[PDB]
Amino acid sequence: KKVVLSSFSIIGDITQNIAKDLVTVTTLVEAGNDAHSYQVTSADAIKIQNADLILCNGLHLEETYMKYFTNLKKGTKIITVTDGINPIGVSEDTDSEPNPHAWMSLTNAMIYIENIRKALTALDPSNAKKYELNAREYSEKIRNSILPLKTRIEKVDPEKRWFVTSEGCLVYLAEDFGFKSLYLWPINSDSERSPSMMRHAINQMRSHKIKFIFSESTNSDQPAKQVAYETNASYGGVLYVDSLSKPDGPAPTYLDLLRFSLTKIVDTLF
Numbered sequence: 001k002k003v004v005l006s007s008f009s010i011i012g013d014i015t016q017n018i019a020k021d022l023v024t025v026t027t028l029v030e031a032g033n034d035a036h037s038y039q040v041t042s043a044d045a046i047k048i049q050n051a052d053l054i055l056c057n058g059l060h061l062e063e064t065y066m067k068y069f070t071n072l073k074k075g076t077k078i079i080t081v082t083d084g085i086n087p088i089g090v091s092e093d094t095d096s097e098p099n100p101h102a103w104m105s106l107t108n109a110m111i112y113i114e115n116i117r118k119a120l121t122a123l124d125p126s127n128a129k130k131y132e133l134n135a136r137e138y139s140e141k142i143r144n145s146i147l148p149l150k151t152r153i154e155k156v157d158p159e160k161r162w163f164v165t166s167e168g169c170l171v172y173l174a175e176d177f178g179f180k181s182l183y184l185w186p187i188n189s190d191s192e193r194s195p196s197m198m199r200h201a202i203n204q205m206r207s208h209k210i211k212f213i214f215s216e217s218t219n220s221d222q223p224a225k226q227v228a229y230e231t232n233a234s235y236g237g238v239l240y241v242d243s244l245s246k247p248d249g250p251a252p253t254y255l256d257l258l259r260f261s262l263t264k265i266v267d268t269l270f
């Protein structure tokens with residue numbers, strides 16, 4: 001039985017839905033661990049050795065631990081599951097390093113799925129028909145759950161078309177649905193979170209009468225709450241974007257993560 005190692009929980013879950021136990025699906029950065037800054041352990045290095053295929057996000061998500069994907073099993077490829085996604089830069093001024101959060105998007109969910117289907121099929125061609133069926137079923141499950149939320153979201157008055165968060169985690173969602181983005185820092189890892197970016201967000205929220213700003217499940221709510229105060233806006237609560245929740249939490253699968261976060265967003269806009 002083949003072993004397919006996913007870099008983090010969101011990719012591992014997508015992969016499990018496509019492979020359904022035809023391969024063993026492992027995960028490097030388990031849920032609750034940070035995919036932006038991770039220390040590969042000795043046990044993790046076993047997972048890396050056992051991998052017949054390695055599935056990474058790319059868009060520099062894994063940049064600080066790519067060095068551990070070395071001394072690999074002969075024939076083991078590293079696949080970038082965001083291939084075909086046009087990158088969005090980390091500069092709020094449009095060039096720069098890529099924003100990695102491409103999975104927060106309905107269109108892109110379909111691309112992650114297709115890339116993973118394609119890679120599994122190249123790895124394990126005797127099961128091509130099963131990966132084919134499974135990928136389509138899962139794509140449809142995603143669409144069936146998430147499309148109605150998009151449909152709701154698209155009714156928003158153009159003046160209110162803003163997703164404002166702490167980390168720049170919704171830039172791909174904004175692009176997918178036709179909203180503008182505002183945030184406090186591009187990526188949670190960066191230890192430099194800047195006064196200028198906070199000042200800018202505050203000024204922009206005032207300018208555009210933006211009513212809500214969120215924080216996320218792996219960062220502090222304190223900046224968002226402060227910005228809310230300074231802008232006469234409201235704190236919108238906690239989104240799930242960077243990791244699956246614990247099994248008994250609200251976002252234990254990728255579909256549940258998208259569904260939770262987009263539900264919470266649309267419940268703010270109306």
Ligand SMILES: [Mn+2]
Pocket residue numbers: 036101167169187188241242
């Ligand atoms: Mn993040």
